[PDB]
């Protein structure tokens, strides 16, 4: 009921694809960031939402910078985050299993401006 | 920007019989800290524990702090404030509580005060007066010690003193003591060899 | 093959000596701060060591500060740490058992400066 | 254009206790490297590998810095900046990183940098400092010398002195040492030569 995930100095998760096991009740993502940059030049955060939904995440969190960790603050469209962060540091985020569905495309993404389009994946 | 005062470094044991004491450490290359007794003076390296005892003949009341400053011992240097050399200043050493420039912290003691004295300029570092455990004969404080007898530009290598006062709850003086300082990179060895020479 | 660790606004934690299993094949320890002091004055970390390796771990780890968590950078002496935390946070860190010896003496301390006498504990 | 200052050679350990140390290599034909601990002086061929050796008491702080710099032995050329020779400074050898006309180099180290300093117009070559590796106990910088002692238009058989200092990340003097060096075709034929009359 929990992966860990590794985003690095050159823009990558060290994974494109998640699949939650649905007998959890609850799913935990441990991030961390294996790289030298501070939050500021390469920040890393954990997003997930629809796919249909991702594009407007990254936009407006793009437009919300560092301080809102590039989110858009009370987004609903985000089903669940990490906070935004930087070389060495680390957060988790546990969300109920209870918001998905089968016959539906999720994405995970990090929203630090321009990461988005190497850095996401499916669930 | 020197002092235009000197702080007093006459023993004073007062009221309550105010004594220093440390612990008998010998002089071993392992030992961090170690007091001689002849020389009256404190070996010990930087940023590592130096405790010292407050041996007291009966109980200061309450509200009683006790209070630590260092000077230098040399008479030119004595109106000069004892400060962090630039290096240490700057480093990323911080224990959330002391100031940058503060020579002197205690460590593992949540009320531990500091001070920037408004008119003398003097760098202070305060803690409440605690009785003995249960048991003990004497108080323990855990100074740390941030820069180095041999820092450029900060003590400059000039000898200096710690002055302990025993103050009541509105700062006045209810007893002095003090002792010589070598913070080092060996205390035991640099304690050996100044003894060799008496 | 597990532990919950806590270190309160006292500069305590609420164990001082851990043993693991030989069974074990990884450990994990879940270190929390249930205090309300943020991290700059009340930070605490679960980092071990070897006994012998303690003392210069603690001193090489002050001096790096806060921003490093308060250790040194790429210490082969430490067998395993969490990251530092503060008040409300919680962070955990999995090491291999193979990493340990019968014969041999560790011990577990936060490298907050000043804390760490008052912080430890065996293993 | 000379420079208007000379800098400092003198000897400094400051904080951590800053020393430096050399291979006991010999000098035998084949070796590129050798250091007289009776002349302080190591002998060295051209763009071969010398090992310099840090040794400190105690650990320098993340974000530490290890300057290089060269200047002439004789005091009535410390004014000169030591640079290449033009046919050196022209030739094909630039790996990148340093400019074509810095005496001195570190090789193996992406993290190197290089100063033509605005004021001095020194030439020097830094390093961050990183601490021993694991089963070590010294830091070891391998440095390059871009010209023979004997290249005409540029040292032209003057000795010189390079000069080590510890920085901290703000610049702040935490040591320093020196070492006469000789870039010579045979370096264990030519430290036999000039400990002769020792
Ligand atoms: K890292
Ligand atoms: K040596
Ligand atoms: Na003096
Ligand atoms: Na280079
Ligand atoms: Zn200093
Ligand atoms: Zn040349």
């Given at each position: 009921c929990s992966v860990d995930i590794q985003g690095n100095?050159?823009?990558?998760?060290?994974?494109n694809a998640i699949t939650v096991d649905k007998s959890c009740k609850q799913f935990t993502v441990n991030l961390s960031h294996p790289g030298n940059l501070p939050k500021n030049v390469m920040g890393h955060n954990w997003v997930l939402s629809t796919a249909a939904d991702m594009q407007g995440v990254v936009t407006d969190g793009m437009a919300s910078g560092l301080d809102k960790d590039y989110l858009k603050p009370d987004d609903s469209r985000v089903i669940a985050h990490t906070k935004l962060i930087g070389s060495g540091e680390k957060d988790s985020v546990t969300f109920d299993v209870s918001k998905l569905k089968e016959g539906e495309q999720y994405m995970f993404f990090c929203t630090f401006p321009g990461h988005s389009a190497l850095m996401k994946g499916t669930l | 920007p020197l002092s235009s005062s000197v702080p007093s470094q006459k023993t004073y044991q007062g009221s309550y019989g105010f004594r220093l004491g440390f612990l008998?450490?010998?002089?071993?290359?392992?030992?961090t800290c170690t007091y001689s007794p002849a020389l009256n003076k404190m070996f010990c390296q930087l940023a590592k524990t130096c405790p010292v005892q407050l041996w007291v003949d009966s109980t200061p009341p309450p509200g009683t702090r006790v209070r630590a400053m260092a000077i230098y011992k040399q008479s030119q240097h004595m109106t000069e404030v004892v400060r962090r050399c630039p290096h240490h200043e700057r480093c990323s050493d911080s224990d959330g509580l002391a100031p940058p420039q503060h020579l002197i912290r205690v460590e593992g003691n949540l009320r531990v005060e500091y001070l920037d004295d408004r008119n003398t300029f003097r760098h202070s570092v305060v803690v409440p007066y605690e009785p003995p455990e249960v048991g003990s004969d004497c108080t323990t404080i855990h100074y740390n010690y941030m820069?180095?007898?041999?820092?450029?530009?900060?003590?400059?290598?000039r000898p200096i003193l710690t002055i302990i006062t025993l103050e009541d709850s509105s700062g006045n003086l209810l007893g002095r003591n003090s002792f010589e300082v070598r913070v080092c990179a060996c205390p035991g060895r640099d304690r050996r060899t100044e003894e060799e020479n008496l």
């Open positions: 100095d050159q823009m990558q998760f060290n994974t | 008998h450490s010998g002089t071993a290359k392992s030992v820069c180095n007898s041999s820092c450029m530009g900060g003590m400059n290598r």
